[PDB]
């Protein structure tokens, strides 16, 4: 249409007039930074042109595929009159549409959101990169000396053609390498985050396409915000910076609850509603989930702000129910049973490297003594320092591993064997035990007291078909862990004291 | 002849949908907010108009009347309400047809097919698609979808050298499509015949509602595939003097004593094994919580002892009597062989997941013979299936988890075969502690030379070897026992306070035997044995059909735990 | 009265009868013509017994002859025995899925709203290049739709007679014969060679 010609000259006049702060045109600085550093990514906020012209925002929300045919052309024209001979090195320059107001979820992706712009949150997995998958398929025939016509490759499923231009044969058709063109590929499977999924439901997952240089800038196992078009999502912009959150009406009552009558013990009694228990497991559990603060001196000497606890005792007691309760309770809690290696993939014998994992979350390990060499060394590296390196399949990336570790184990033989130390009891050695600051251990109770309480509570749980409530407690965890910062055994007790000060919500 | 009949049947269907305010108008008013358009119309509610004659005429020409029905539905939602896909589903047919009664006289008609799902495929985007020509910029939007999807017969500009061929596009058009495998049920297979299976296609939002390994009932249209006779379903559901005998059998007092000797009439002796097998069949409450998590309310039974015994006979009885019973040999299994096997790129298509022995026959007895010759992978898969009630399968990019509730009948043997008394159960069973756990009851059988019961056993063996003797005659048949099992299954009893007050003292009395033990003791006692006797209490409450349990019936379960 | 249109006929009774010795020696060489004329004569003698006519005027009845003597399987089946009745005793091993066969052909046009129905003539479909000349002229505008076509059941069954013969059953006899039974079968030997079953036992 010729209507794009009156659209083009409108935004060509817009880029030379946007002066929002102190009369300065920021687009000239943006075009000189993309021209001097040879970049192809141009940044445009949605609010700027939306305040300028809402019809362009309506056209971008309705038909972004035809709206993107004007943007790249006017950006290359602005770069060509601002910089001479820029077309010799870079032929096309794309744009990055950011600041989308209506952030959607993965469960709200419906048929009405087709062929439109959408900003969705998620977690990235399955990293396969820099592969030129087919976009125009041709076929060599062996029964005749001809070729098949051009067929557009449907990106979700392969196409089988039996008819050829000369006859009707039974012979197979092969891919012609002299005519087939391949477009780039960034096949990433994105998933919904577990910290905002409703209870009872399962998190969905989609496939995202990444093209024209934004490959390997994303970190697997982290929260991400992607703005793209919906058709399979074709991402335009990625953001590695980022429904159950704190409000203004709930934040005043949290300080009012934290000020009166010693809430540390109430949080401890609110930790285990299913059983009576004892405070030694839940005190370590609450101080590990609430955590401490990470501090550095002049950019170096990074201390670990997480607390890794280790549970031990006979297998008849409860050790998995506490982590099963904290998997639902705490935010970004991952229950595993975190390594980066080259692994086989069954579809067409594919080869890729799977990176490790919850960067701010808590990972829960059950049956710690029953593992191999790779998952022991990876957790020892993540317990020693806070990063996991990937050095395979053509990629080298050192990712952040600042996660808390809650591990549960069993001794060799069932019995704890109290007339021997823990180093002779467990099969583990001392430097893997030194990363765990708190080592909680239970024992067997023969007496009338435990028999009077445990059996009565478990029969009260079966005969039926004061503390802080669960919702306020899980909202208080996210409210205290994201706003305040109150200023090896010595490092551990300072972390436990600052974690108790974090739970007490004090200034120091 | 149906070109003028289609508008009349469209007018009749829209008159049926317009004159009834049936619950259809409020159903459209409810889906107005969500815009899914995957409606459900009952065939029993449609069978009253035109004395059923409107239903009989639609019932044979369903594929020839389907766009007229969707056009009438589109016109009534266009007039009663202001990106448009539609799915009309029919359900609740009065006749249930098998897979062996499908003929070619019902091609194109609607049909109700019941059976069991064997395999499931991945979801795929179906076409339903602008076509560009390589000579000019012409475009078309009227697309065909079943067959001949590449050649449209018209262009907007007829001046061309070749009006036949075009080129497809992937940009301007596309939803979920699935192909599953249905098979003949085990109770309606002919004598000597094979359980013939068939592939059924499914579209709309009827996909991912069918769980693999369950009895299912579909309603759809018989469509031929180049030929083969496939099926298209639109509705999915998870299906699956008598009271004078039942009320007479619940009023007496000696029912349980005939029940423990009538659950296995071919086996001489072993009343404890028969007690655990009879109490294994029916469980207790699994949702006994206030937090929101389901618990293990099932009974796990494991039999051990010396070889050449009659312990496999129970194994051959359960599977010949219980309808919800899957038997495996153990050695002819794996991790994927027991739960979910996968095909690997066969017949041109992608991977397909076939259902194994696990997750089949829910709330029934899965019986595994030779439990100790299995590998480590299937035993940790059994432990992962027993730690949590759901099971997760992560393969080819897709992740799928499902509910499972089965009771394990594990037949094991020692490392040397002969059971020696001088050591514990752990070193003789030869399996690790977490897979040795979550087992409610262990049955150890030892044999020796005791002539008085041995001569009776050998006489029973030689008296059984004849044409249908009364030597294995039970006091009552299985005819009332099946409905008694079902009547006790839908009972749901509730424990009492006096039983709990006696139970805490009984747990203290059972744990007092651990003190100065290593004589009349072979294993540890913790919360798991307490949970086993708690689960056996509601099972004996259901077997005696009492709503409120007394501790005297839990005393027999305490004696059963003391006998093991 | 019960609606069973099938008639089981014993050929041995036609053999011992005083008047029909010329009929038993005529149906062993030409079964396709005598079955087609027996379908008319059985309807004629049934309406002679009648003289219920609202349904038997359009109903069809057939004849299944099985009482014939034994033979030496497929080894004695020489080329002078083509299109003759034959009997095989053995066991079936494999039952294929049901394949459809066209009985009438549908022909939908792209223009002028005229559809054409035609019938099969023992294997060939007469495709009309013409387009019903009372209506408008078109040289090649014609299509074929498979979903509106009428089909009949067909099935190839493996039989162990040792030789493996591929027999083929048709409509109203499908899913009656399957692997596992000692089956006596009889029909017409055709020509790769096969046997078109007239009866199973």
UniProtKB/Swiss-Prot annotation, chain A:
Domain of life: Eukaryota
Residue intervals of the MCM domain: 263-459
Molecular function per GO: ATP binding; ATP hydrolysis activity; chromatin binding; DNA replication origin binding; helicase activity; zinc ion binding
Reactions the enzyme catalyzes: ATP + H2O = ADP + phosphate + H(+)
Keyword terms: ATP-binding, Cell cycle, DNA replication, DNA-binding, Helicase, Hydrolase, Metal-binding, Nucleotide-binding, Nucleus, Phosphoprotein, Zinc, Zinc-finger
Binding site for ATP: 313-320
Cellular component per GO, a single term: nuclear replication fork
Primary location class: nucleus
Protein name: DNA replication licensing factor MCM2
Organism of origin: Saccharomyces cerevisiae (strain ATCC 204508 / S288c)
Upper classification of the organism: Eukaryota, Fungi, Dikarya, Ascomycota, Saccharomycotina
Gene: MCM2
Residues of the full protein shown: 201 to 828 of 868
UniProtKB/Swiss-Prot annotation, chain B:
Annotated ranges, domain MCM: 255-462
Family: Belongs to the MCM family.
Organism classification: Eukaryota, Fungi, Dikarya, Ascomycota, Saccharomycotina
A single GO cellular-component term on record: MCM complex
Catalyses which reaction(s): ATP + H2O = ADP + phosphate + H(+)
Function: Acts as a component of the MCM2-7 complex (MCM complex) which is the putative replicative helicase essential for 'once per cell cycle' DNA replication initiation and elongation in eukaryotic cells. The active ATPase sites in the MCM2-7 ring are formed through the interaction surfaces of two neighboring subunits such that a critical structure of a conserved arginine finger motif is provided in trans relative to the ATP-binding site of the Walker A box of the adjacent subunit. The six ATPase active sites, however, are likely to contribute differentially to the complex helicase activity.
A GO biological process held by the record: DNA replication initiation
EC number: 3.6.4.12
Protein name: DNA replication licensing factor MCM6
Phosphothreonine sites (modified residues): 496
Annotated binding of ATP, by residue: 305-312
Note: Present with 13400 molecules/cell in log phase SD medium. Early fractionation of eukaryotic MCM proteins yielded a variety of dimeric, trimeric and tetrameric complexes with unclear biological significance. Specifically a MCM467 subcomplex is shown to have in vitro helicase activity which is inhibited by the MCM2 subunit. The MCM2-7 hexamer is the proposed physiological active complex.
Species: Saccharomyces cerevisiae (strain ATCC 204508 / S288c)
Top-level taxon of origin: Eukaryota
Motif Arginine finger boundaries: 437-440
Keywords in alphabetical order: ATP-binding, Cell cycle, DNA replication, DNA-binding, Helicase, Hydrolase, Nucleotide-binding, Nucleus, Phosphoprotein
Parent sequence residues shown: 103 to 834 of 1017
MF terms (GO), sorted A to Z: ATP binding; ATP hydrolysis activity; DNA replication origin binding; single-stranded DNA binding; single-stranded DNA helicase activity
Annotated localization: Nucleus
Phosphoserine PTM positions: 193
Top EC category: hydrolase
Predominant localisation class: nucleus
Curated annotation (Swiss-Prot), chain C:
Function: Acts as a component of the MCM2-7 complex (MCM complex) which is the putative replicative helicase essential for 'once per cell cycle' DNA replication initiation and elongation in eukaryotic cells. The active ATPase sites in the MCM2-7 ring are formed through the interaction surfaces of two neighboring subunits such that a critical structure of a conserved arginine finger motif is provided in trans relative to the ATP-binding site of the Walker A box of the adjacent subunit. The six ATPase active sites, however, are likely to contribute differentially to the complex helicase activity.
Protein name: DNA replication licensing factor MCM4
Family note: Belongs to the MCM family.
Species whose genome carries this gene: Saccharomyces cerevisiae (strain ATCC 204508 / S288c) (Baker's yeast)
Compartments, record wording: Nucleus
Miscellaneous: Present with 8800 molecules/cell in log phase SD medium. Early fractionation of eukaryotic MCM proteins yielded a variety of dimeric, trimeric and tetrameric complexes with unclear biological significance. Specifically a MCM467 subcomplex is shown to have in vitro helicase activity which is inhibited by the MCM2 subunit. The MCM2-7 hexamer is the proposed physiological active complex.
Coiled-coil region list: none
Quaternary organization: Component of the MCM2-7 complex. The complex forms a toroidal hexameric ring with the proposed subunit order MCM2-MCM6-MCM4-MCM7-MCM3-MCM5; loaded onto DNA, forms a head-head double hexamer.
């Amino acid at each position: 249409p010729n209507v794009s010609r009156t659209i083009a000259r409108e935004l060509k006049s817009f880029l030379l007039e946007y002066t929002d702060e102190t009369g300065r045109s920021v687009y000239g600085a943006r075009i000189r930074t993309l021209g001097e550093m040879n970049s192809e990514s141009l940044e445009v906020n949605y609010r700027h042109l939306a305040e300028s012209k809402a019809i362009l925002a309506l056209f971008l929300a309705k038909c972004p595929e035809e709206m993107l045919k004007i943007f790249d052309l006017v950006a290359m024209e602005a770069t060509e009159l601002h910089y001479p001979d820029y077309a010799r090195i870079h032929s096309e320059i794309h744009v990055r549409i950011s600041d989308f107001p209506t952030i959607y979820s993965l469960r709200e992706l419906r048929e009405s959101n087709l062929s439109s712009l959408v900003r969705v949150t998620g977690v990235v997995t399955r990293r396969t990169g820099v592969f030129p998958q087919l976009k125009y398929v041709k076929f060599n025939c062996l029964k005749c000396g001809s070729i098949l016509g051009p067929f557009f490759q449907d990106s979700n499923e392969e196409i089988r053609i039996s008819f050829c231009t000369n006859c009707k044969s039974k012979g197979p058709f092969r891919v012609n390498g002299e005519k087939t063109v391949y477009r780039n590929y960034q096949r990433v499977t994105l998933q919904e985050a577990p910290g905002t999924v409703p209870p009872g439901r399962l998190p969905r997952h989609r496939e995202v396409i990444l093209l024209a240089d934004l490959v390997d800038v994303s970190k697997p196992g982290e929260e991400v915000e992607v703005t793209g078009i919906y058709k399979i999502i074709e991402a335009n912009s990625i953001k590695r910076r980022e429904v159950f959150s704190w409000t203004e009406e709930e934040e005043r009552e949290f300080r009012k609850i934290s000020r009166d009558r010693g809430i540390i013990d109430k949080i401890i009694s609110s930790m285990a509603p299913s059983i009576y228990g004892h405070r030694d497991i839940k005190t370590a559990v609450a101080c590990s989930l609430f955590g401490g603060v990470p501090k550095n001196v002049n950019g170096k000497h990074s201390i670990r702000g997480d607390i890794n606890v280790l549970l031990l005792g006979d297998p008849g007691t409860a050790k998995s129910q506490i982590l099963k309760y904290v998997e639902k309770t705490a935010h970004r809690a991952v229950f595993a049973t975190l390594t980066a290696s080259v692994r086989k993939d069954p579809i067409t014998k594919e080869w890729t490297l799977e990176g490790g994992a919850a960067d701010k979350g808590v990972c829960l390990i059950d049956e710690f003594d029953k593992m191999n060499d790779q998952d022991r060394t990876s957790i020892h590296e993540a317990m020693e320092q806070q990063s996991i390196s990937i050095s395979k399949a053509g990629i080298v990336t050192t990712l952040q591993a600042r996660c808390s570790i809650i591990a549960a184990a069993n001794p060799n033989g069932g019995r704890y064997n109290s007339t021997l130390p823990l180093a002779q009891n467990v099969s583990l050695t001392e430097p893997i035990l030194s990363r765990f600051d708190i080592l909680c251990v239970v024992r067997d109770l023969v007496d009338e007291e435990a028999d009077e309480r445990l059996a009565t509570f478990v029969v009260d749980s079966h005969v039926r078909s004061s503390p802080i409530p669960q919702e306020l407690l899980m909202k208080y965890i996210h409210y205290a862990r994201t706003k305040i910062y109150p200023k090896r055994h010595l490092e551990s007790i300072l972390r436990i004291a600052e974690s108790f000060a974090k739970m007490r919500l004090s200034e120091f | 002849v149906d070109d003028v009949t289609g508008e009349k049947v469209r007018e009749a269907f829209e008159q049926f949908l317009e004159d009834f305010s049936k619950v259809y108008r409020a159903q459209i008013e409810f889906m107005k907010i969500y815009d899914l358009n995957t409606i459900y119309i009952d065939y029993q509610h449609l069978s009253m108009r035109e004395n059923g004659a409107l239903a009989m005429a639609i019932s044979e020409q369903y594929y020839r009347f389907l766009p007229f029905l969707q056009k009438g539905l589109r016109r009534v939602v266009r007039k009663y309400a202001p990106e448009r896909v539609f799915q009309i589903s029919f359900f609740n047919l009065p006749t249930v047809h098998r897979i062996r009664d499908i003929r070619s006289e019902k091609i194109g008609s609607l049909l109700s097919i019941s059976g069991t799902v064997t395999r499931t495929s991945e979801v795929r985007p179906e076409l339903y698609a602008s076509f560009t020509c390589d000579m000019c910029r012409a475009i078309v939007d009227n697309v065909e979808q079943s067959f001949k999807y590449t050649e449209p017969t018209f262009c907007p500009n007829p001046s061309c050298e070749n009006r036949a061929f075009w080129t497809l596009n992937v940009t301007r058009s596309f939803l979920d499509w699935q192909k599953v495998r249905i098979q003949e049920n085990a109770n309606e297979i002919p004598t000597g015949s094979m359980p013939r299976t068939l592939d059924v296609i499914l579209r709309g939002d009827s996909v991912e509602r069918a769980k693999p390994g369950d009895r299912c009932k579909f309603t759809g249209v018989e469509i031929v595939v180049p030929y083969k006779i496939s099926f298209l379903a639109c509705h999915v559901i998870s299906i699956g003097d008598e009271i004078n005998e039942l009320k007479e059998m619940v009023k007496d007092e000696h029912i349980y004593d005939k029940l423990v000797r009538s659950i296995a009439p071919a086996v001489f002796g072993h009343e404890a094994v028969k007690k655990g097998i009879l109490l294994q069949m029916l469980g207790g409450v699994h949702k006994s919580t206030v937090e929101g998590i389901k618990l293990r309310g099932d009974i796990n039974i494991c039999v051990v002892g010396d070889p050449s015994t009659s312990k496999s006979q129970f194994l051959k009885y359960v599977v010949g009597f219980a309808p919800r019973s899957v038997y495996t040999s153990g050695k002819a299994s794996s991790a994927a062989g027991l739960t979910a096997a996968v095909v690997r790129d066969e017949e041109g298509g992608d991977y397909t997941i076939e259902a194994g022995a696990l997750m089949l026959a829910d709330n029934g007895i899965c019986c595994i013979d030779e439990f100790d010759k299995m590998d480590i992978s299937d035993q940790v898969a059994i432990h992962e299936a027993m730690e949590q009630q759901t099971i997760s399968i992560a393969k080819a990019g897709i992740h799928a988890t499902l509910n499972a509730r089965t009771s394990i009948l594990a037949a094991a043997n020692p490392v040397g075969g002969r059971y020696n008394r001088k050591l514990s159960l752990r070193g003789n069973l030869n399996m690790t502690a977490p897979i040795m756990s979550r087992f409610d009851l262990f049955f150890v059988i030892l044999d020796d030379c005791n002539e008085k019961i041995d001569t009776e056993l050998a006489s029973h063996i030689v008296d059984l070897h004849m044409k249908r003797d009364e030597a294995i005659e039970p006091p009552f048949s299985a005819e009332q026992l099946r409905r008694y099992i079902k009547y006790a299954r839908t009972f749901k009893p509730i424990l009492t306070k006096e039983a709990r007050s006696y139970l805490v003292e009984k747990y203290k009395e059972l744990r007092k035997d651990d003190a100065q033990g290593f004589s009349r003791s072979s294993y540890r006692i913790t919360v798991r044995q307490l949970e086993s006797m708690i689960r056996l209490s509601e099972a004996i409450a259901r077997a005696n059909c009492v709503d409120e349990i007394t501790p005297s019936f839990i005393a027999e379960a305490y004696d059963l735990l003391r006998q093991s | 009265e019960l609606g069973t249109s099938n008639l089981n006929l014993d050929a041995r009774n036609l053999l011992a009868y005083k008047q029909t010795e010329d009929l038993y020696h005529q149906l062993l060489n030409y079964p396709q013509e005598v079955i087609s004329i027996m379908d008319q004569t059985i309807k004629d003698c049934m309406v002679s017994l009648i003289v219920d006519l609202d349904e038997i005027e359009t109903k069809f009845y057939k004849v299944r002859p099985y009482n014939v003597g034994s033979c030496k399987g497929m080894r004695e089946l020489n080329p002078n025995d083509i299109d003759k009745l034959i009997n095989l005793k053995g066991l079936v091993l494999r039952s294929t899925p049901v394949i459809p066969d066209m009985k009438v052909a549908f022909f939908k046009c792209n223009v002028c709203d005229h559809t054409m129905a035609v019938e099969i003539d023992r294997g060939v479909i007469q495709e009309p290049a013409r387009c019903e000349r009372i209506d408008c002229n078109e040289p090649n505008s014609m299509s074929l739709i498979h979903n509106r076509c009428s089909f009949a059941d067909k099935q190839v069954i493996k039989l162990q007679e040792p030789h493996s013969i591929s027999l083929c059953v048709y409509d109203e006899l499908v899913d009656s014969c399957r692997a596992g039974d000692r089956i006596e079968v009889t029909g017409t030997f055709r020509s790769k060679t096969y046997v078109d079953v007239v009866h199973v036992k």
